[PDB]
Each structure stands twice: as C-alpha cells, then as structure tokens.
Design a protein around this ligand. Structure first.
Ligand code: Z0P
Ligand code: Z0P
Ligand code: Z0P
Ligand code: Z0P
Ligand code: Z0P
Ligand code: Z0P
Lengths: 264, 264, 264, 264, 264, 264
C-alpha cells in the first residue's frame, strides 16, 4: 500500500537541483561557442514575421507560471499522498531538463537580435564561467530577478515548466472540477503565446518542447499505473531512477484530500 | 478474413503521388521567402564542425537507398498479401511527408553554404514556379537524376525513406532471418551518417526525422494489430484515411510466401 | 429536507456586491476610450424619433423600482424559506451583471446627445478612477442620489433590475392571487417604457436586456426544479457557483406562510 | 409513417423566397432614413481597433459559404428523406431572416466609413425602390457578383448562412463522421473571423447572430424529435406555420442514405 | 536419414572459388599500399634468427600438401557419404579465408626482405589489376606454377590448407588405424616447419593461423554432432550458410566403406 | 559447501604478483634486442592512417581503468563470497599475462616512431636490468605516474585490464542490473578507442587482446559452473593450478550480498 517515504523525496530534490546546476553550466559553455550570435538576420518564421514584438510580453509568461505554481502549491498542501506527488514532479523535471541539455549541446539555435546589449561575454577562464553559472542557477532563470540578460537556445524552458504544472494541476484534482482545468489550459496557452510573441524563441522550439513534455508525462503515468516495473521485464524502462522511487507505490494514487494541521 | 482489394490499392497510390507533388511545390514557395540563404555562417554544430566535408558522401546515401528498395521489391514479389503491404507503404509515406510540409512552412532551416552555385532563382510568376515544381517532382528528388541543385530545409527526406524501408523489410520477413535484419540496419545507419558527412543537413534535422518515422510506424501497427478502428471509439485515430484502408483487414497479416507465376 | 443555510447566504451576499463594484470599475474605463460622447447625432430609431424626450420620465422608472422592491421585501418578510429566496436573488443578479461587463467591454454603444453637460472626464491617473468608481458603486445608480451624470451603454441595468424583481414576485406567490401579478406586470412595462421615452437608451438596448434576464431566470428554475445538478452529467452547467448553493435544496420550494416574530 | 409530401415542400420553398424579397425591400427603406451614413467615426470596438483592415478578407467569407453549400447539396442528394431536410431548411431560414427584418427596422447600426464610394442613393419614389430591391434580390447579396456596394446593417446575414449550413451538415450525417463535422467548424470560424477583419460588422453583431441561429436550431429539433406539437398543449409553439409543415412526420427521421437514380 | 544432396554440393562448391577469387582481389590491393616492401630489415624473431634461410624449404611444403591431398582424395573415393564430406570441406575453407581477408585488410604485415627481386608492381589502373587477380587466382598459389613472386602477408594460407586437410583425414577414419594418423601429423608439422625455415612468414603468422583453423574445425563438428541448428536457439550461429547445408543431415556420419564402381 | 579458505586466496595473490615481476623483466630483455626501434616507418593500418594522433587520448584510457577498478572494489566489499571473486581474478590475470609473455618473447611488434624521446637504453649488464624492471614493476605501467616512457609491444596490457574488469562487474552482479552492465561497456569501448587514436598499438593487437580475454573468461566460468574438473576425465584442463584452487567450491556461487562490518 502507499507508504509515505520521506527519505526519498530529499534524494529526488537533490537530484533535481544538481540537474539544474548542470543545465546552467552547460548553457554558459554553449554560449561560449559563438562570439557574436547577434549579427545574423533571423530565419524566416511564420509567427515572428507577422506579429511585431511586444516589449512586455515576456513578464506575463512568468506571471502565469507563478499563478500556476501557487495553485499547485495549494493542491499539494491539502492532499493525503503529497510525498508521492512531490516525488513525481522532480523525477520528471530532471529528465526533461537533461533532454534539454542534450538537445542544446548538439546544435545551438538562438534568435538573432534580441538581448543585443547584454554585457559580460568572453568569460575566458575556468573560475569565471562558474560565477555566471551560479548567477543563472540562483536567479531561477526568470526575467524578473534579472539573470536572463543574453538570449536562450533550443528547447525553451518556460514552456516545459508551464506544461508540466498545467498537466499536474489537471491530473491531481477530482474529475468533476472542469472549470479549474479550463482556467489552467487557458493560462498555459496564453503563456506559450506570450513566449512566442516576445520574439524570444522560434515556433519549432515551442512545439517540440510542448510535445516532449506532454509525451513524457503521459508515458510516465501510463507506466506508473500499469505497474510494469515489477510485472515483468517489459522494456527496461529508460526513465532515470524510476523503479527506485515507485517500488513502494503499487497501483494508482487516489484523490483523497485532508487538512494537515491539528487546529480546526 | 484478408480480402485482396485491388481497387483500394490504386486509390492509395494516387494519394501518394498527389502528396509528393504538393511537397515539391511547397519547396519552391519556401525557397522564395529569403533570396540569399547562402551568405550566413552556419550554426555551431557538433558533427558538422568535427567531420570535414566528403564530396562523394551524398551520392552513397542513395546507393544505400536503392539496395534497400530492391530488397523490399523482392519481398513485395514473393508474398501472399502483397496488396496489403503496398497499401500500407503508401498510407505511411503520405502521412509522414505531410508532416514535412508543416514543419518546413513554419520555420525554414537550411545549411548556409553548400550548393551555393545553384542557378535559376527569382521565379517571379505563377506559371514558372510550377515548371520548377515539375522538375523536382519527376526526378524523385535524387542527386543522381540532377534535380537537387539548391539546398534543402528542415525534416530531411532521405532519412524518412531510408528508415521506412528498413522497418518494412524487418517487419515483413520471418523472425528467423536475423542476418538480413542486421544487414538492413547497417544500410540505414550508414546512409544516415553520410547525410551529415556531406554537410547537407544539421544534426537535429536527422534526429527528428528518424524519430518521427520510427514512432509513426510503431503506432500504425499497434492500431492495425489491436484492431481499434471497429473495437470502440477509442481515440478517433488521426491517421489520414485509416479506417477506409484497414476495414477489410482483421487482425494481423501473416508471413506466408508463394510464387505468383504459373511456370515452375 | 429544506435546510436553511444561514452561512451560505452570507457568501452569496458577498458575491453580488463584488460584481457590483467590478461593473462600476469597468464603466469608467469604457468612458475613457473616446472623450466626446456628445457630438454624434442620434441614430435613426423608430421609437425615439416618435416620442419626445421627457425630462421627468427617467425619475419615474426609479420610483417604480422602489415600489416593486417593497412588495418583494414584504414577501421575503413573511415566508418560511426566506433564506433560500434571498440566496437565489444574489446568485442570479451576480450572473447577469457579469454578462453586462463583457458586452460593454467588447463594444461601447451609448446615447449620442443626452447628458451633454455632465462634468468630470479626463481622469489621467490610476488612483482617481478608483474614487470615481467608489462614487459609482456607492450611489446604486439612481438619479435621486445623483451619481449617473453622464450617459450609459448597451444592455442597461434598469431593465435587468425591474424585470428580475417582477418574476420573483409572481413566482413565489400562490396560484390564486392573480390580481397582484397584473399590478406587478403593469409596473414593469411602465418602468421600461419610461426608460425609452427618456432618451437614455436605444430600443435594442432594452430588448436584449429583457430577453437575457427572462431566459436566465427560467433556465435557473428549470434546472433547480429538475434538480439535475446531481442526477447525472446533465449539461455541464456553466452557472457560477450553482451546485454549491443548491446542493442542500431538493425538489421545489413550497409557498407556506407564517409570522416571523414570536409575539403574534 | 414518413410520407414525402412533395406538395408541402414546394409551399415551403416559395415561403422562404417571399421573405427574401421582403428583406431586400426593407433594406432600401431603412437606407433612405439617414442620407449621409458615411461621415461619423466608428464606435469603439475591441476587435476593429487592433486588427487592421484587410481588403481581400471579405471575399474569403463567401468562398467558405459556397463550399458549405456544395457539401450540403451532396448531403441533400444522397439522403433518403431529401424532401424533409429541405423543408426544415426553408422553415428555419424564413424565421431567422424575419427576425433580421425586425431588428433592422427597429434600429439602425452600421460601420461609419466603409463602402463610402457606393453610388446611387436618394431613391425618392414609389417604383425605383422596387428596381433597386430587385437588383439586391437577384444578386444574393454576394460581393463576388457585385450587388452589395453600400454598407450593411445589424444582424449580419453572412453569419446566419455560415452557421445554419454548419449545423445541418453536422446534424444530418451519421454520428461517426466527426471529421467533416470538425472540418465544417473551421469553415465557420474562419468565415466568422474574416468578416470581422474586413471591418464589415461590429464585434457584437457577429456574436448575437451566431447565438440566435444556434439557439433557434437546437430548439426546433428538440420540439420535432419529442413531437411536442401534438402530444399536448405544451407551449403554444410560436414558430410561424410549424404544426402544418411537421404534422405528417412522426418521431425522428433516420440517417438512411440511398441512391435515387436507376443507373447502377 | 542421411540423404545425399547432389544439388546442394554444387552450390557449396561454387561458394569456395568465389571466396578464392575475392581473396586474390584483396591481395593486389594490399600490395598497392607500400611501394618498396623490400627495404625494412627483419623484425627480431626468436625462430628466424636461429634457423638460416633455405631456398628449397618452401617447395617442400607444397609437396607435402599434394601427398596429404592424395590420402584425403582416396578416402573421398571409397566412402558411403562422399557427398557430405565434400560439402563440409567447401563450407569450412570458405569461412577461414573470409577471416583472412579481414585480417589482411585491417593491417598488412609481410616478411621484410624476401623475394626482393619480384617484378610487377605499380599497377596504376582499374583493369590491369583484374588481370593480375586471374594470375593469382588461376595458379592456386604454389611456387611450382610460379605465381607467388612477391611476399605474403599475415594469416598465411599454407598453414590453413595443411591443417584443414589433416583433421578430415583423421576425423573420417575408423578408430583402429592409429598409424596413418601418426603419419598425417608428421606431414603437417614438417610442412609448417618448412614455412618458418623458408623466411616466408613470421612466427606469429603461423600460430594464429594454426589456432583459428583448429578452433573453427572443432566448433563446426560440435554443432553438427549436437544438431543444435534446429533443436533450439542454441547460440545464434554466425557460420555462413550453416543451417542451409546441414538441415538434411542429422546425428553423426558413420564410417561405412564400399566400392564406388559397379564392377567389383 | 562454500568454505572460504583464506590460506588459498593468499597463495593466489602472491602467484599473480610474481608473474607481474616476470612480465616486467622480459620486457627489458626484448627491448635490448633491437637498439634503434624508432627509425622505421609504421606498417600500413586502416585506423592509424585516417585518425590523426591525439596527445591526450592515451590519458583517458587509464582514467577509465581506475573507474572500472573503483566499481570492482565496491563489488568486492559487499559480496558475501569476497574470498572467491578475488581468487578467480588472480588466477585469470596470471594466465592471460603469461600468454602475453609468450607472444612478446616469440616475436617483437611495436609502433615505429612513437615515444622516440625516451631516455636510458643500452642496459648491458646483469644487475641494471633488474633496477629498470623494478621501476616498471612499482609503477603499474601507468603513464599518469610516468614509468612507461618508451614504446610498448604486442598484446597490449591496457586492453586486458579494461576487459577483465568489464566481464567481472557484469558477471558478479544480479541479472537485473543491466544498466551498470550497459555503462561498463561504454567505459570499455572508449578505452579501446582511445588507445588506438593515440597511436600506441596496431589495430590487430587490440582485436586479438579483446578476443583472448573474452574467450578465456567464458571458458573458465563454464568449467567452474559444471564442475567438470572432478566429474570425470573431461579434457585434462590446461589452466595452471586449476583443480587446486577450485576444489573446495561445489556448484555455482550465488549472488548474495552482505555487509561484513558489525556497525549497523
Ligand atoms: C524542489 C524543486 C521543485 C520543482 C518545482 C518546479 C518549478 C520550477 C521552478 C523553477 C525552474 C527554474 C529552473 C532552474 C534552472 C535554470 C535553467 C535555465 O537556465 O533555463 C532557463 C531558460 O532561460 C529556464 O528558466 C525557467 O525555467 C523559467 C521558469 C519560471 C516560471 C515561474 C517559476 C516561479 C516559481 C516561484 C514560486 C513562488 C510561489 C508563488 C508566488 C506567489
Ligand atoms: C507507388 C509509390 C510507392 C512508394 C515507394 C517509396 C520509395 C520512395 C521513392 C521515391 C521518393 C521520392 C520523393 C518524391 C517527391 C520529392 C520530395 C522532395 O522533393 O524532397 C526530397 C528532398 O530533396 C526527398 O528526396 C528523397 O526522398 C530521396 C529518396 C531517394 C532514395 C532512393 C529511391 C530510388 C528508388 C528507385 C527504385 C529502383 C529499384 C532498384 C534499382 C536498382
Ligand atoms: C441582501 C441582498 C439583496 C439584493 C437586492 C438587489 C436589488 C437591486 C438594487 C439596486 C441595484 C443597484 C446595483 C448596484 C451597482 C449598479 C451598477 C451600475 O452602475 O449600473 C447602473 C446602470 O445605470 C445600474 O443602475 C441600477 O441599478 C438601476 C436600478 C434601479 C431600480 C430601483 C432600485 C431602488 C432600490 C431601493 C430599495 C429601498 C427599499 C425601500 C425604500 C423605502
Ligand atoms: C439548393 C438549396 C441550397 C441552400 C442554400 C441556402 C442559402 C441562401 C443563400 C443566399 C441567401 C441570399 C439572400 C438574398 C437577400 C439577402 C439580403 C441581404 O442583402 O443580406 C446579405 C448580407 O447583408 C446576405 O448575404 C448573404 O446571404 C451571404 C450568403 C452567401 C453564402 C453563399 C450563398 C450561395 C448560395 C447559392 C446557391 C446555389 C448552390 C450552388 C452550390 C455551389
Ligand atoms: C573441391 C574440393 C577438392 C579438394 C582439394 C582441396 C585442396 C585445396 C587446394 C588448393 C587450395 C588453394 C586455394 C586457392 C586460392 C588461394 C588464395 C591465395 O591466393 O592465397 C595463397 C597465399 O599463398 C594461398 O596459397 C595456398 O593455397 C597454399 C596451399 C598449398 C597447399 C598444396 C595444395 C596443392 C593441391 C594439389 C592437388 C592435386 C591433386 C594430386 C596431384 C597429383
Ligand atoms: C583487489 C582489486 C583488484 C584490482 C585489479 C588490478 C589489476 C592490475 C592493474 C595493473 C597491473 C600492472 C602490472 C605492472 C606491469 C605491467 C607490464 C606492462 O608494463 O604492460 C603495461 C602495458 O603494456 C600494462 O599496463 C597496465 O597494466 C594498464 C592497466 C592500467 C589500468 C588501471 C589499473 C590500476 C588499478 C590500481 C588500483 C589498486 C588499488 C589498491 C590495490 C590493493
């Protein structure tokens, strides 16, 4: 039966923080490849050529992200099996950001011309790249806490977080609340549109990020519900550290909600 | 039971040749977006920067792609249900080549500098684009029958044909011939490697083309074997013209082989 | 059984004033779009071009509302289930006014020429409008407490209030008092007629206001009497907080009468 | 049983065409009210201010209308009860277009500044109005065959036809073809979008013309399926000549399709 | 039962000469790499530095091969299952020489200093090399019919032929003639010794040639005697055309003797 | 039963270390044969001619060696039968490294031109050879602790250690951990690739050193599992001191893991 294991969530959180630090360092290394990356003319896109740049459109994506994060925290506060829920967010965020690192290492696709005045650059040493990596790490990558000074490459990260939070909010609420689901979907779509309308990413980056996050979520939940980690040697599931986390969870996690405080 | 429907196969062959003629016209519309597309420096890649250009490598991809065609043509000749096999090859080469027109329209990603001397260009009219679209159509896009004069955009097409023929040969041969299966997998991988060694496609062009054809092949044969087109209203299968072709085929197609000629 | 919920009515009451304040906030924003609002000549109307403008007709409509309010208040005073009746008035007046904001925001149609001497306007700030909205909110809209100095837009609220009160008066009275209903009906028609004769709204401003309140009033009661909110997935009700308020009420509310005080 | 009364269908077709003549004539009458109707600035809108005017947008609205009429003719030919589907169409179009005559006559609302170059005007006589109305009558109000040269009024007729032919293709096809049903929505939404983008009608005339036809279609079919016209004294149905047309039809018409011609 | 297949042996015989010709084609290509091939001093060898070069030692090895061939040919003449014995020789000599080409192609190691006066070389063409191959192929490699004029590379074929013939001589004789087997072993060891004493190959050239032929000979017979080619998925045999040739032979071939002619 | 004879393991560990001293001494003897060994041009290879020399490649070979040794020490500590796994490792390394002494002594094969700057040479005496050999003995032949300054000979020792420690991690872990098994292949393959890319050993010394250890490992464990040493007079097993070491072990050793220390 569902066993609250509080010593595995710590491991998952540590794994995700390590993954985020690795992603920041890889981003700095990749940015070190090409010096200018801001002199070319952009590729002919279908949405970046029609809709002109909206200067304030990039903060609205993070506003939507914070709203979704607050809703998800509220959901997590009033649940029975909150440990399993917190252990499933991390094991998926780490994997998707590892895929982002792999995609960004092979080929670097930026947008030629926004953030053209970003300072710093030419970080030639081993101990000066680490300070920039630390800033990007403990700045959360957001544009509000100013870290996002230069541009960003393939496999956008805001879309991943938005889609993951939307899918988790929709999944772990009772199947009778079909207005919060619509609100979350609207927030996700508006965030994606505002990522596209700020001229920060190409259309294909957003599309592949959305598809990859959705497919990985659905596949992970299908494997977890089918309970194939102990059924047989099905396919040797390639999710990093999968059977270590879901071994004690058999079947499907129900949707029981309580109040944790002992003060009515 | 398996009914040989020789008139549904003809409808499938016509469906492909319309799709192949639609893609050839899009590739001329897209080429008119940006005139130069040959002055920029290329994106920083991990394979295009290490391995230098091999001038003869792009011709060996099609040589590897004709051996797999001849081998498959022999399978299509000594089979009982060759009508269904030819109807499944066409129903998939159209769906995948339709996805190529979608991703080549939203954003156009070419390689800045090969085929820099290709003539023609500035096809400003409605009746001169069609003539250029006819040359590509009745040349199969190959570099031997000289049509491939200028560059090519996202979602490479050589990787789609190589991977589709490799999976059909493996699928429709007895599960005891695991040397022809290994030989076909070698021609697939060597053909893919020579696209990158000729500096014709980016390292991410070839990975999403390989992934999509592999994923769509396994998804088609899951539905075709589970037989979900009449089981229930599962998901309203989005494959273009799926239930029209597989309605008369129930279950799985066996692997019986014969000789069609009546002259022993 | 019919359990009077004295804590849900308080939540219901809070809902309607927030919408009342929110509507007032939108009204000042709409007035900011075009400054003049007093140069266009009246559009050709088959009703306004016949009846001359009457300065005292507008005050007569507000008089009728008070009389109808007194009749309804007396009914609420001598009813067994006075808690439920008050909860339905707030759950239906808060929905209609939500539609008023959407109609007024998408397009703005006022009366071109009346109240041309109204003062105020040109509020260039983000704090003065809040005080102006407070004046709009804490004046209840009547001209007796002069707040509505300038013109008004589409889907007038005088018709919403006059019609909504009339239906509750007729609905929650026994089917043997068919003399008060005639008095209530003539008052509603007289009040609506005075609005049109006062040149305060267009003819189509009233008709779509008369239809929407009646359609929503009857749709609310049909669902409540059928109690389909829990029977099955009837229609995926889009009424704001419908199942929450009416979960404890089953069947149809009777028309029993008593005396509220304990001193007969 | 379902007996095709061809003498009743003819009376239905002539009934709707008289309404078309009545609608065209009253359009000239309301035009004669305000002479200029091209000097005012447009009212503030939320969609007519952001999206700029597209000269060719209004042509695509009628292109989608022709396709939706071409599929409907295909459905009309192959349906066994082709004498019933046509009779219901004539009995619904006449009612909706009669409501359009009422709203145009009660009040006038147009776009002040488009189609300012249309000639003619000041048709002050008894007989010249008929000639101008006849030109509109035998032009279908289409712009491809240029008749509609001046502006248009409230309750846009392009929205009704685009929607009425969208809810008959969906309704009168088997409930397993939900791709043509999906396709006919794109033909409707894009036809709705393009008339707004061409600055032909306000953002509220389009919405209340999409709602009325959707409401007046579902209400009609609910009455017919439950045969409430003869079951009892249900509601004194207000559809003009409803019990006369649908007296020989009992129950719901099936979805049986047959080929009428005798040349297999 | 043991069915002599007179048509499979013909297919088996064709296989070995094609490999013999293919090996000869590779030999001339390897000689093209280094032009001199006769300048390096011999590497330090514990066997070559002791035994002086003997000009007539090389001719003695070819003499021993003919004597061993005569003994084997006589056995093949007076055996019941002479078809199977001849089929196995061609199926084992065509596999070892395939490994010879791979070893010789990857690296080229010859004797640095012998046959320094050999003519030919510098064949700059693509047709003259083929005519040289026929000289190599149609001379069977012996020095009696002088073809092997220059040196030879790693994995000498003299050891392969001498060792392969010896094992068949011992294997297919009854276990009571343990005097011919001793004579056969003396011829094999004497022939191998003459190769080393002739300064025609290195010491490691012979050892890895002696091991591979013996290992493959015993591995072939163990699989055939165990008849695991059809018993189960034993080891996924990588022998070229192993199951095809030995499908009709079950168990172990006996050692019955007869007379071939019909005239005793 | 499995009785850990700690007096037998010590005799195994001392036996392998004497072979290490023997191997180091004979390397000096063969080095004294040819003085120059740095003047000849390299033999024609297929991998040493395409890939240019990478100066830092040979360092990564030893880095992978330490990691494979670090994981093995982890396995050697948590295994219940840690006294058996170590004994088999010592009894296999001595046999393989004894074959290396035989092939190095019979013939000499090195890369002519690498490590041409190594000093020393001409160690002509009886006692100085021991001092030079002792330096190689207490340096593990590693280049990180620079002892191996001159060239290396046939049967590369870096291939044996990289492969022997790859087939013990795979063998002596439960048959459900096939990701560390997968990981240890990448460590082996890259260690194999880097020694070739550094121009340290020919392309045939690497292949016949990967084959011998793989063959001599599987053959040993097949003999031990079937206890053929005492079952009968099977083959007169040629492993040096085989029946002595594996006489107290019956059957196959299980995969039970336990913590030896008494501090839970
Ligand atoms: C214990 C871990 C739980 C995981 C929770 C998942 C939520 C994601 C949070 C942060 C992701 C940032 C990635 C760090 C590594 C940078 C990678 C990079 O350098 O790549 C960045 C692209 O430049 C990616 O940046 C982003 O991912 C932006 C996402 C921000 C969306 C809003 C998140 C704000 C949360 C605040 C919560 C407050 C609660 C309510 C407030 C009222
Ligand atoms: C009836 C149809 C059956 C379908 C069979 C599928 C085989 C694919 C064949 C051709 C695909 C070409 C695409 C046409 C539209 C151009 C799109 C474009 O313009 O895009 C092109 C990219 O520039 C795509 O080009 C390609 O697809 C190259 C693939 C060629 C690989 C070799 C095929 C040669 C077959 C010859 C058979 C001979 C038999 C043995 C010979 C000894
Ligand atoms: C416990 C809660 C019960 C709720 C009762 C609701 C009754 C509606 C009353 C007033 C509606 C005002 C809406 C506030 C926001 C306006 C938005 C706007 O600013 O829009 C205005 C449009 O001009 C709406 O104006 C109106 O509300 C016109 C309605 C006037 C009808 C007469 C109302 C007089 C009631 C007085 C009762 C006194 C009792 C007897 C006196 C002796
Ligand atoms: C055979 C039965 C088919 C049923 C189709 C019925 C649809 C009615 C069409 C047009 C009504 C026009 C009314 C005239 C006066 C309107 C007053 C006005 O002036 O109002 C106009 C706008 O204010 C109304 O304009 C329109 O009606 C726009 C609708 C155009 C959409 C395509 C209509 C083409 C119908 C042709 C039928 C032939 C079939 C060939 C198939 C390709
Ligand atoms: C169909 C089966 C018949 C049985 C006979 C099998 C004996 C094989 C003979 C020769 C194999 C030569 C391989 C051809 C391609 C060489 C590749 C290369 O080009 O490589 C050569 C490198 O030197 C290999 O040369 C050799 O084959 C040396 C082997 C010589 C051993 C003596 C062979 C003499 C046989 C004469 C038989 C005559 C019968 C009695 C005479 C009175
Ligand atoms: C109980 C744990 C077992 C560990 C297995 C160690 C295997 C021996 C490694 C190397 C043997 C070197 C022999 C010296 C003379 C070779 C002749 C020559 O000079 O030949 C050299 C090349 O020709 C051989 O070089 C090598 O041996 C390459 C192997 C390097 C890979 C890393 C090995 C280092 C592991 C040390 C960790 C030990 C931890 C404490 C121990 C208690």
């Amino acid at each position: 039966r569902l066993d609250p294991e509080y010593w595995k969530t710590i491991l998952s959180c540590i794994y995700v923080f390590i993954v985020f630090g690795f992603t920041s360092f890889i981003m700095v290394i990749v940015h070190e490849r090409v010096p200018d990356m801001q002199t070319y003319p952009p590729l002919p896109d279908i949405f970046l050529d029609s809709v002109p740049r909206i200067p304030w459109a990039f903060a609205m994506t993070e506003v939507c992200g914070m709203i979704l994060c607050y809703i998800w925290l509220l959901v997590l506060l009033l649940h029975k099996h909150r440990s399993i829920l917190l252990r499933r967010l991390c094991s998926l965020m780490g994997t998707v950001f590892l895929l982002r690192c792999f995609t960004m290492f092979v080929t670097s696709l930026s947008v030629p011309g926004q953030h053209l005045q970003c300072t710093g650059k030419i970080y030639g040493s081993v101990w000066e790249k680490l300070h920039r990596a630390f800033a990007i790490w403990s700045g959360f990558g957001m544009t509000l806490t100013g870290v996002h000074t230069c541009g960003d490459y393939m496999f956008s990260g805001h879309t991943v977080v938005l889609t993951m939070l939307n899918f988790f909010v929709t999944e772990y609420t009772p199947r009778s609340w079909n207005f919060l689901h619509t609100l979350s979907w609207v927030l996700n779509l508006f965030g994606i549109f505002f990522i596209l309308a700020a001229h920060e990413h190409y259309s294909i980056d957003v599309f592949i990020a959305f598809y990859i996050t959705t497919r990985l979520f659905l596949y992970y939940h299908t494997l977890a519900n089918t309970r194939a980690y102990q059924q047989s040697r099905r396919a040797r599931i390639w999710f990093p550290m999968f059977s270590f986390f879901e071994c004690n969870v058999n079947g499907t996690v129900p949707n029981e909600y309580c109040w944790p405080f002992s003060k009515p």
